[PDB]
Design a protein around this ligand. Structure first.
Ligand SMILES: CCCCCCCCCCCCCCCCCC(=O)OC[C@H](COP(=O)([O-])OCC(O)COP(=O)([O-])OC[C@@H](COC(=O)CCCCCCCCCCCCCCCCC)OC(=O)CCCCCCCCCCCCCCCCC)OC(=O)CCCCCCCCCCCCCCCCC
Ligand SMILES: CCCCCCCCCCCCCCCCCC(=O)OC[C@H](COP(=O)(O)OCCN)OC(=O)CCCCCCCCCCCCCCCCC
Ligand SMILES: CCCCCCCCCCCCCCCCCC(=O)OC[C@H](COP(=O)(O)OCCN)OC(=O)CCCCCCCCCCCCCCCCC
Ligand SMILES: CCCCCCCCCCCCCCCCCC(=O)OC[C@H](COP(=O)(O)OCCN)OC(=O)CCCCCCCCCCCCCCCCC
Ligand SMILES: CCCCCCCCCCCCO[C@@H]1O[C@H](CO)[C@@H](O[C@H]2O[C@H](CO)[C@@H](O)[C@H](O)[C@H]2O)[C@H](O)[C@H]1O
Ligand SMILES: CCCCCCCCCCCCO[C@@H]1O[C@H](CO)[C@@H](O[C@H]2O[C@H](CO)[C@@H](O)[C@H](O)[C@H]2O)[C@H](O)[C@H]1O
Ligand SMILES: CCCCCCCCCCCCO[C@@H]1O[C@H](CO)[C@@H](O[C@H]2O[C@H](CO)[C@@H](O)[C@H](O)[C@H]2O)[C@H](O)[C@H]1O
Ligand SMILES: CCCCCCCCCCCCO[C@@H]1O[C@H](CO)[C@@H](O[C@H]2O[C@H](CO)[C@@H](O)[C@H](O)[C@H]2O)[C@H](O)[C@H]1O
Lengths: 606, 177, 155, 51, 126, 459
């Protein structure tokens, strides 16, 4: 337990030496981007030893490193729950970040402050490993809020760009709406269980956890960009592509799904929470896929792909399938990260052009990227025996053979076909048509800092799901018995989605003009949710902030009632009693009244 | 960006501007270059057609009708150049455009590393000061007796004279610092 | 800065309107005070409610971010209309058409989810079955108290 | 020593303050070694439990 | 068809009837506006490009705006029936609403502790 | 305490008898060495409070406040040093004297063992503070801000003096230990309801409570830098410290008399937070930020639960360091462009990259980023307020969202976007300005590693 504990603790120390170096004079002498990349690599390799020991023993740990403070009868300790989820996620996350760190040295080679960019990515990784291995809600919240800040600084990397700053504040606003949920759950457990530690929270399995579980579902909704709080994910694509690959697809966005996997022992006895995850998730997968079908920016298509796969993980949790929802996160990190890297390779080689309408014929000019770009698409669309088949296939097998919402089942299968339709959109327009980019061609992709990190993911996109699926313990009983059409249902719709896409995308070659329709306008304009909610809601609130609060109350009626009326009253009196005519005749006449009043007063008291 | 706008667009400017907008949106729908070329020639047919209609009271009614037709057949998401307003690279490097005056606070030990850049810079600061007086004088001499004014500026009409108000244009930071 | 260069009270006479306009660098025919409901505007100009997204992006504005020019009168709600916040620019789709479509979709999906709750999809399979009295002890039932025999048969 | 003497001002204040607190203790010894909680017998060479 | 404007989705300049006005009265409005605009732009430039400047360029338009929105509100405030009702509702409206939410909740809570019908099972911090 | 007080009384002769070229070095050197001595108070190895004499005594509530006061004096001297460089010598020494006098009274105010002694010291602080705001303020409105500050306090403080006298005429003494160990339950008669408001309105005005807070945005917006630092960091906490101290003798009337003030704080804090969204003046945005944080402190003290007191004490110290750091940062811009408008200067991260880091860390403390003690306060106040009633989470949820917006909007507006390139007078940050920020932030980080020191009396 010393070697397991020491390696677990040692991962954090390795990732903190780049942070320490960045704060000394050494950073100006070494190749800091390479130093961080080597540092994270060794961290990943060490992260395999705790991983193997768990594959052998399946034995989880609870390591309390530090005692922070006691609040009477409630101690807060830095403690790590090195169980199944944090052991495996830690390795997948450190493996992806080894690719993105090395990718960045090639992608950001012009940015003068490149080694601040490296430092921030390291800080995000640390606040993501804090989140995933936390043993108590408070230490969850450090990572929960920490990745929230680290997202803000990286989405707003180009702080002179006004749309980056608006997208960064937009990410913060939605994630603070989900902080309410997290804080709601935290107060509830400290009041009804006297603890924030996951061990003590377990003995709440027989309470009625509606209030805490609603809080966690709202926090998960905001953090994973589920319907209602979803705009911030496609908007986060302002930041540099290495940020999009690392945070907003393969780590930060799975925090909400990861959270509800931690608390699965409670959500298994709540049908209201399960049914909400099943319907909230189903809506997310369909709605974002419909959006992705007619986008033109390459990243927003990929970003909208994530929202849809995130919703599907949510649908999984409504089946009470926590270990499938997690296995999807671990599988989805590989190819999705690669798609951003393969897409981010094109963007760099075409003068930072991202509209797929100005891309074409990439399967020839960029062979390597296109090849990895098609492995990623097929892994994503659940082709057999790729990383994404050992997760997606089981989920589609489960969604069919469970008692569930008929409409959630129906739209979730449609959204699984649309995953092939919009992937085909990229394969088609990006790799298959004729060139549409400008005529000066300076496409280079021979850099090892580009090919090597993409290759690592490419191997992960092929073999990783297989290895993961065969080494984890048996979790739940799969319903392996079903008619022949429920057992191939995923494949047929995915094949059908491709076939439907080919016909549709091959009418664009016809010399017939394309016209607007309400259905494509809805798809292209994100269902109008941003165009309304981001205009009406901030107007009414900011209009109240000024007209009601500042002006009507503080500046006006709170002045008028207290300080102003008090000064008016006393100025009124000092005016009445001071304007005397200076005539002794009148003074004595008042002295005469005074004397009579004293005589009268004394008279009626005899 | 370089040219200040006029007081009002003429009919000729409002129709050319529409023509360019309507082609860029066509290219957004068509995508494919052969398909974009075909319909771009049809578009020109619709603008050559009423090219000569010189009524000047139905030419307008042919423009408001055509703008109301453009606004209905917009692409909901037109293509934008990455550096253009609304583009993905728009203002990306504005955080790297430090004004030249920030060098006037540099420490000497910093200025000691670029002795020859910092020597070709005191020449420019001299040239700026000697020229200033003559620049202000020229701008009054051309202040039209009628208040009617335009944002444009006059050139140097003489020898040894730089055009008035030239420092914030000549010294502006590079587009890609 | 002096009292007549600063905002004042509502202009009652046309002679104090042309004074106010000249203060704010406007044409007299363009100066327009807020309506005199005594909400504290005084004579500050009432300017059209266009956010700064609508300003010519290609012009070289003096205040580059705000898309204003030096000296020009500033809208009362400028800080609500900067480019980081509320946008009033024209949309391709009419405001109400978006509003009717968005909530029609959300409303329809809410309806169809309830439909799916009253007609759920399931499989023709009786309930799972567990041994030892529905695993009575392992669920934490009391060792001393005797559960109720719940039994399952081979069929 | 006609422009540096001012550095005994504050150090003197501390010393004077520490001594002034030693008097406040000398004035409040009415319950020394008499509390129900800490009262004990005096050790061989012990004159007072605290000073 | 046709485009219906709203405050949060204004009218495009190209669909504005008053933007194709060409009668001489408008064109003269549009030329004085430019002249006022250019007169200021010229003055800003004569400070921006000045080499003897050593400080920033003070902005009267910004001083007026901030002063109009703080030091000048109260002098230009006159009580009226609509203000007084608005302040009364804005002032005590929310405060009364919440009073009954909390008072009602805590009365139901104090009622359920006298009859023991509460489950404070593991609660030992408050 | 006479070893923290007497050396501090000696900074006054040392201010006047020092050379013209040594006043600022000498005094600021010995102020640090006085805040070191105040750490002796932290040597609390037992559950008995430190009673030094019949006058002074330190508790776990009065020790963090005492130390925060002593540490703030050297900070304010460095803050006031560049905007007083043009004054003749006697004005600087007269400014240094008014700041020292405010540290001496504040330490005596928190260490006092009797309510009457607290009141007099609690009123004496108006003199040096009124002199600072008015004599050394900048705008013509500083005269109206001194009146608002002086007479909000005094009007509230006259009833408190009456009530304190009634307590002694009945109990025989005003000693805080005796009143604690002999407290008798009050009857619910209409006279004790007024005794309660008499004992409370003085402190509820100084917080300030919503409604009667218009003195604070006036005072801050016009005080010199060291005027805002002491106001936002200590003088507001006189209200909180008083209410905790005197509410022991007011039971059980706090179970119902508090409703109007829990409701003004909970609703009031939303009104003040939302103001910071539309506030055009940077120094004004921070001042309303203070009003909305003290709202939680008022609300948590009114419910008298071990958690609520614990959260309020942490938030008192956390707000003390954070609001002061913000005022110093806003001053740093102001001492360059002499304008308080928030939107006037933009993109300052381009030319002040390090000062833009302190902005970010101050802003993150203000929006209570875990694990900073700013969150511990907000979090433990929420926990207690939830137990008090469950629907307070609705209002605290909102206020947390608004608090993120105006914190980042403050950072995005002034530190990002394009640079306002006409500001050729943006000099590089002084070593003095950067030390001032490090001195605020380092203690705040250290206190997060050892939160035990600011849990207050209950924990
Ligand atoms: C003090 C002595 C140490 C020496 C400091 C030093 O020399 O710094 C030089 C170093 C390099 O010199 P530089 O080029 O001038 O950098 C300044 C740049 O302008 C720009 O500086 P920068 O932006 O590159 O670096 C500043 C960095 C902020 O400073 C950092 O470097 C991050 C370190 C973490 C704090 O900014 C951030 O990234 C904010 C991070 C927010 C953290 C979010 C997660 C918080 C929760 C996790 C923590 C709790 C874990 C508990 C475990 C459970 O710069 C700095 O570190 C900033 C100096 C101020 C110190 C910041 C606070 C750390 C102390
Ligand atoms: C809960 C209510 C909270 C309402 C928020 C009030 C305070 C907001 C202050 C800041 C507002 C703001 O900054 O708005 C600007 C931003 C515009 O973003 P956007 O227009 O999409 O960017 C386009 C650029 N090309 O707008 C935004 O990005 C902010 C998004 C505001 C909408 C948040 C509403 C939360 C979700 C509630 C609806 C859930 C439906 C289910
Ligand atoms: C000190 C403690 C401060 C805290 C107490 C504040 C609680 C009150 C807050 C709410 C007050 C609401 C008042 C709204 C504002 C009203 C106002 O300010 O208007 C001033 C108005 C001046 O009217 P005017 O005609 O000039 O008075 C007669 C002189 N010819 O009206 C006047 O000034 C004239 C008032 C004359 C009547 C005064 C009543 C005195 C009765 C004493 C009975 C004993
Ligand atoms: C590395 C930091 C470090 O030294 O941490 C160790 C220590 C925390 O250890 P500790 O809390 O005592 O352990 C208890 C059970 N874990 O950390 C500490 O004890 C350091 C505590 C820092 C104390 C502040 C030092 C004085 C700074 C001036 C004070 C200004 C702030 C005013 C507020 C004062 C409130 C006390
Ligand atoms: C619940 C208890 C709280 C009670 C608080 C009561 C506090 C009383 C504060 C006394 C305020 C005196 O206020 C005094 O008059 C007004 C108040 O607007 C200020 O005057 C200001 O506004 C008035 C408008 O009436 C103008 O004429 C004047 O030019 C301007 O300076 C004075 O400068 C100030 O000296
Ligand atoms: C029980 C006592 C509790 C209240 C405490 C006393 C607080 C003081 C309030 C009374 C004094 C304030 O009195 C306030 O003085 C200001 C000073 O500007 C007067 O305002 C005056 O300002 C200036 C100069 O004085 C004049 O040019 C102007 O015409 C006039 O309005 C206000 O009309 C009056 O309201
Ligand atoms: C409870 C804390 C103790 C409070 C102590 C009260 C201190 C006095 C406060 C009132 C202010 C004293 O008033 C202050 O007088 C000094 C000199 O006496 C003046 O000083 C200034 O002006 C005079 C001449 O005009 C010069 O001699 C002097 O060198 C110059 O600095 C200040 O401009 C004035 O503000
Ligand atoms: C706006 C300012 C508000 C002023 C607030 C002042 C605080 C309020 C104090 C409580 C009210 C007076 O409290 C008063 O106390 C006195 C004694 O002290 C008692 O009153 C009684 O005292 C004694 C008995 O004790 C009797 O002989 C006497 O006839 C009667 O006055 C009652 O207890 C209450 O009537």
């Amino acid at each position: 337990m010393n070697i397991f504990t020491t390696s677990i603790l040692l991962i954090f120390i390795l990732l903190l030496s780049p942070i320490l170096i960045s704060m000394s004079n050494l950073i100006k002498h070494i190749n800091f981007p390479l130093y961080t990349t080597t540092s994270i690599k060794f961290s990943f390799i060490i992260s395999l030893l705790p991983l193997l020991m768990f594959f052998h023993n399946n034995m989880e740990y609870m390591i309390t490193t530090w005692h922070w403070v006691t609040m009477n009868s409630m101690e807060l300790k830095m403690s790590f729950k090195t169980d199944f989820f944090s052991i495996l996620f830690t390795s997948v996350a450190l493996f992806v970040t080894w690719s993105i760190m090395q990718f960045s040295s090639w992608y950001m080679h012009s940015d003068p402050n490149i080694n601040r960019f490296i430092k921030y990515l390291t800080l995000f990784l640390i606040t993501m490993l804090i989140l995933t291995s936390a043993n108590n809600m408070f230490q969850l919240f450090i990572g929960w809020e920490g990745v929230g800040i680290m997202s803000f600084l990286l989405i707003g990397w180009w702080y002179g760009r006004t749309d980056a700053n608006t997208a960064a504040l937009q990410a913060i606003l939605y994630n603070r709406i989900g902080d309410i949920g997290f804080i709601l759950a935290m107060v509830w457990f400290s009041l009804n269980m006297n603890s924030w530690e996951l061990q003590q929270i377990m003995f709440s399995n027989n309470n009625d956890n509606l209030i805490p579980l609603m809080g966690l579902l709202i926090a998960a909704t905001g953090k994973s960009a589920q319907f209602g709080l979803h705009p911030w994910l496609p908007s986060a694509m302002e930041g540099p592509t290495p940020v999009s690959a690392l945070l907003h697809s393969s780590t930060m966005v799975v925090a909400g799904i990861f959270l509800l996997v931690r608390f699965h022992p409670l959500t298994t006895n709540n049908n209201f929470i399960l049914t909400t995850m099943l319907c909230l998730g189903a809506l997310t997968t369909l709605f974002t896929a419909i959006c992705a079908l007619t986008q033109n920016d390459i990243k927003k298509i990929i970003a909208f792909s994530t929202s849809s796969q995130l919703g599907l993980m949510m649908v999984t949790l409504g089946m009470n399938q926590p270990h499938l929802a997690f296995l999807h996160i671990c599988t989805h990190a590989f190819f999705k990260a690669m798609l951003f890297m393969c897409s981010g390779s094109i963007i760099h080689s075409l003068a930072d052009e991202q509209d797929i309408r100005k891309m074409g014929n990439i399967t020839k000019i960029m062979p390597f990227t296109s090849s990895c770009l098609v492995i990623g698409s097929l892994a994503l669309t659940g082709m057999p025996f790729l990383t994404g088949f050992y997760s997606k296939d089981l989920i589609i097998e489960a969604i069919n053979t469970c008692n569930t919402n008929a409409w959630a089942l129906l739209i979730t299968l449609i959204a699984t076909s649309m995953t092939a339709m919009y992937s085909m959109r990229i394969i088609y327009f990006v790799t298959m048509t004729k060139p549409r980019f400008p005529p000066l061609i300076s496409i280079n992709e021979n850099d090892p800092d580009l090919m090597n990190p993409i290759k690592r993911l490419a191997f992960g996109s092929i073999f990783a799901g297989f290895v993961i699926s065969y080494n984890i313990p048996p979790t739940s009983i799969p319903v392996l018995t079903m008619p022949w059409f429920l057992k191939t249902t995923a494949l047929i719709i995915s094949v059908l989605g491709f076939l439907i896409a080919l016909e549709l995308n091959n009418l664009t070659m016809k010399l017939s003009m394309n016209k607007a329709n309400p259905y494509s306008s809805f798809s292209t304009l994100l269902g109008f949710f941003p165009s309304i909610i981001h205009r009406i809601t901030p107007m009414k609130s900011l209009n109240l902030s000024l007209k009601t609060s500042l002006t009507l109350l503080d500046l006006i009626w709170l002045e008028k009632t207290i300080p102003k009326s008090t000064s008016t009253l006393h100025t009124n009196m000092t005016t009445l009693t001071t304007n005397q005519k200076g005539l002794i005749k009148l003074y004595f006449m008042s002295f005469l009244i005074n004397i009579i009043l004293i005589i009268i007063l004394y008279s009626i008291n005899l | 960006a370089f040219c200040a706008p006029p007081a009002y667009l003429t009919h000729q400017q409002k129709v050319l501007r529409l023509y360019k907008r309507a082609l860029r949106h066509l290219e957004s729908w068509c995508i494919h270059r052969d398909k974009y070329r075909y319909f771009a020639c049809l578009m020109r047919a619709r603008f050559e057609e009423h090219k000569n209609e010189k009524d000047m009271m139905r030419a307008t009614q042919l423009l408001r009708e055509a703008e109301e037709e453009f606004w209905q057949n917009q692409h909901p998401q037109p293509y934008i150049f990455p550096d253009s307003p609304g583009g993905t690279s728009f203002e990306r490097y504005e955080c790297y455009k430090v004004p030249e005056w920030c060098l006037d606070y540099w420490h000497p030990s910093e200025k000691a590393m670029y002795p020859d850049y910092f020597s070709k810079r005191e020449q420019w600061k001299k040239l700026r000061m000697e020229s200033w007086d003559r620049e202000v004088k020229q701008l009054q001499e051309e202040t039209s007796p009628d208040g009617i004014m335009t944002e444009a500026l006059p050139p140097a009409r003489r020898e040894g004279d730089l055009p008035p108000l030239w420092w914030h244009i000549v010294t502006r930071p590079r587009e890609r610092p | 800065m002096t009292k007549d260069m600063l905002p004042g009270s509502y202009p009652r006479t046309p002679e104090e309107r042309a004074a106010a306009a000249k203060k704010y660098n406007m044409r007299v025919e363009d100066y327009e005070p807020y309506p005199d409901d005594g909400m504290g505007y005084g004579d500050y100009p009432m300017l059209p409610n266009r956010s700064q997204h609508e300003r010519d992006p290609w012009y070289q504005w003096d205040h580059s971010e705000l898309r204003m020019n030096w000296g020009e009168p500033i809208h009362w709600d400028l800080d609500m209309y900067i480019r980081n916040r509320v946008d009033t620019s024209p949309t391709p789709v009419s405001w109400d058409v978006m509003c009717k479509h968005l909530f029609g979709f959300v409303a329809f999906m809410v309806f169809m989810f309830w439909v799916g709750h009253v007609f759920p999809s399931y499989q023709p399979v009786g309930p799972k079955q567990y041994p030892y009295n529905n695993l009575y002890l392992e669920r934490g039932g009391d060792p001393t108290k005797e559960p109720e025999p719940v039994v399952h048969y081979d069929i | 020593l006609r422009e540096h003497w001012v550095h005994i001002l504050v150090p003197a204040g501390f010393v004077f303050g520490c001594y002034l607190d030693r008097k406040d203790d000398e004035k409040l010894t009415a319950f020394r070694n008499k509390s129900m909680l800490f009262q004990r017998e005096l050790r061989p060479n012990e004159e007072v439990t605290w000073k | 068809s046709k485009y219906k404007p709203a405050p949060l989705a204004t009218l495009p300049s190209t669909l504005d009837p008053a933007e194709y006005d060409v009668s001489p009265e408008t064109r003269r409005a549009q030329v004085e506006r430019l002249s006022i605009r250019a007169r200021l732009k010229r003055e800003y430039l004569l400070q921006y490009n000045d080499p003897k400047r050593v400080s920033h360029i003070e902005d009267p338009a910004l001083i007026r705006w901030t002063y109009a929105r703080s030091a000048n509100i109260y002098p230009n405030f006159r009580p009226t029936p609509k203000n007084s009702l608005l302040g009364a509702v804005a002032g005590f409206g929310p405060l009364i609403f919440w009073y009954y939410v909390f008072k009602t909740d805590r009365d139901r809570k104090e009622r359920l502790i006298q009859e023991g019908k509460l489950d404070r099972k593991f609660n030992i911090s408050y | 305490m006479l070893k923290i007080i007497l050396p501090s009384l000696m900074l006054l002769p040392l201010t006047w008898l020092s050379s013209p070229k040594k006043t600022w070095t000498n005094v600021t050197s010995y102020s640090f060495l006085i805040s070191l001595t105040s750490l002796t108070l932290l040597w609390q190895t037992d559950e008995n409070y430190k009673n030094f004499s019949n006058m002074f005594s330190s508790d776990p509530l009065s020790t963090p406040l005492i130390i925060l006061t002593a540490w703030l004096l050297p900070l304010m001297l460095m803050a006031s040093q560049n905007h007083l460089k043009k004054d003749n010598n006697v004005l600087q020494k007269l400014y240094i004297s008014m700041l020292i006098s405010l540290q001496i009274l504040l330490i005596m105010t928190f260490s006092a063992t009797e309510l009457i002694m607290f009141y007099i010291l609690f009123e004496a602080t108006l003199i040096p503070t009124l002199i600072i705001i008015t004599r050394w303020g900048n705008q013509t409105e500083r005269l109206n801000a001194g009146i608002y500050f002086l007479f909000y306090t005094l009007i509230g403080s006259i009833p408190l003096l009456i009530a304190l006298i009634l307590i002694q005429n009945h109990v025989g003494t005003l000693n805080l230990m005796i009143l604690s160990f002999t407290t008798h339950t009050l009857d619910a008669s209409w006279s004790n309801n007024l005794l309660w408001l008499a004992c409370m309105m003085a402190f509820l005005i100084k917080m300030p409570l919503y409604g009667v807070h218009l003195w604070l945005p006036k005072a801050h917006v016009e005080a010199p830098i060291a005027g805002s630092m002491i106001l936002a960091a200590i003088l507001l906490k006189l209200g909180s410290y008083g209410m905790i101290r005197i509410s022991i003798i007011l039971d059980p009337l706090t179970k119902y008399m508090a409703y109007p003030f829990i409701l003004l704080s909970l609703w009031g804090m939303i009104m003040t937070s939302s103001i910071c969204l539309r506030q055009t003046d940077l120094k004004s945005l921070i001042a309303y930020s203070s009003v909305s944080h003290m709202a939680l402190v008022i609300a948590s003290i009114m419910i008298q639960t071990p958690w609520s007191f614990m959260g309020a004490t942490m938030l008192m110290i956390a707000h003390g360091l954070t609001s002061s750091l913000l005022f110093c940062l806003a001053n740093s811009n102001y001492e360059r462009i002499h304008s308080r408008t928030m939107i006037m200067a933009r993109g300052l991260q381009m030319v002040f990259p390090l000062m833009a880091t302190w902005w970010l860390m101050a802003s993150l403390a203000n929006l209570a980023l875990p694990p900073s003690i700013n969150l511990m306060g907000e979090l433990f106040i929420t926990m207690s307020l939830f137990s008090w009633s469950n629907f307070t989470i609705i209002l605290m949820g909102i206020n947390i969202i608004i608090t993120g917006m105006y914190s980042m909007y403050m950072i995005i507006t002034t530190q990002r976007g394009k640079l306002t390139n006409h500001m050729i007078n943006l000099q590089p940050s002084h070593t003095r300005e950067l030390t001032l920020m490090a001195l605020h932030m380092i203690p705040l980080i250290l206190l997060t590693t050892s939160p035990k020191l600011i849990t207050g009396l209950t924990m």
